[PDB]
Amino acid sequence: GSEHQGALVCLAESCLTLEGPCTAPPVTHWAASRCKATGEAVYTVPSSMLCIS
Amino acid sequence: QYLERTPLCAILKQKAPQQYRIRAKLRSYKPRRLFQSVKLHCPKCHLLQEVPHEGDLDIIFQDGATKTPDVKLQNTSLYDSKIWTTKNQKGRKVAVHFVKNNGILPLSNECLLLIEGGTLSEICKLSNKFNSVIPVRSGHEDLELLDLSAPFLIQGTIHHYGCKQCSSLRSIQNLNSLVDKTSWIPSSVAEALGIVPLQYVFVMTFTLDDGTGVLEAYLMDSDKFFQIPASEVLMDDDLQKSVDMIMDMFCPPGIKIDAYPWLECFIKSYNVTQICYQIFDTTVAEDVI
Ligand SMILES: [Zn+2]
């Protein structure tokens, strides 16, 4: 029925931000450290150095 | 009964490939910035890739928000569609498509959403209330995946990515081919869309020292070593703290190697074409909590 559909539409709408200023979301501490460390060298190993199976 | 440990000086004098049970202290490790350990690995082409940053994803999703959802692609036998208008967002319009199972919408926790014009924040909130989210755009004849640079499926805290090289991208109607529309197995979703899924792995380089020798050994695994899924860690603050504390336990900054605990593990040697080493069949998490 449409009333179950209606419920899902309301649940969807509750997750959206359709008005006002789109504020910045609260982020985890690795992602915060990641944002700060932009520009610096990125640790990297070529896949040929690793043993994959 | 027969637990014996091979000294590192012995291992360094031997030819590869072989396997060794060792005990050594973690003198040092890379990466120093632990978030850089989380890599994406294609099982098909064996390429290693960086996980896109928030900023990278924000660009993609904002760019998606400039495009107007096509009314022709709304309300099919596969999904019901709803369009929200906005205010003070450059005239943005968000389309959410609710995927049906046999012409019926399932419960929210079994219901897959396809979204046009949503932000990363909105997508992540939707992923809490619903089974999963695919970011999509209005193609010429069908809905299509927004961009393989962004996740092809967000499910729980897991942002699933696909290999750009190996994938042959198919349009959204191909989700009809899935056995049900309530389980939403990531690999099944990927196959339906012609996507080869990337695998999350912790990649680190350990410098091991047992006082007889020194050796560089790689870590490459998804969930065995830490008993923390690499697929969840970047979106879970508690799992990040656990990885921090485990690395801080084995190799605490400042203090001397004399005080570090011992790491019990297996390592396999192998020939690159020089001999490299890699940890296997090892978890620190079974005896530490
Ligand atoms: Zn690939």
Numbering used by the authors:
A (entry chain B): 264 to 316
B (entry chain A): 341 to 613, 619 to 634
From the manuscript:
Human telomeres are protected by a specialized six-protein complex, shelterin. POT1, in a complex with TPP1, binds the 3′ ss overhang in a sequence-specific manner. POT1 and TPP1 function together by forming a stable heterodimer that protects chromosome ends and regulates telomerase activity. Here we use structural and biochemical analyses to show that the C-terminal half of POT1 contains two domains, a third OB fold separated by a Holliday junction resolvase-like domain.
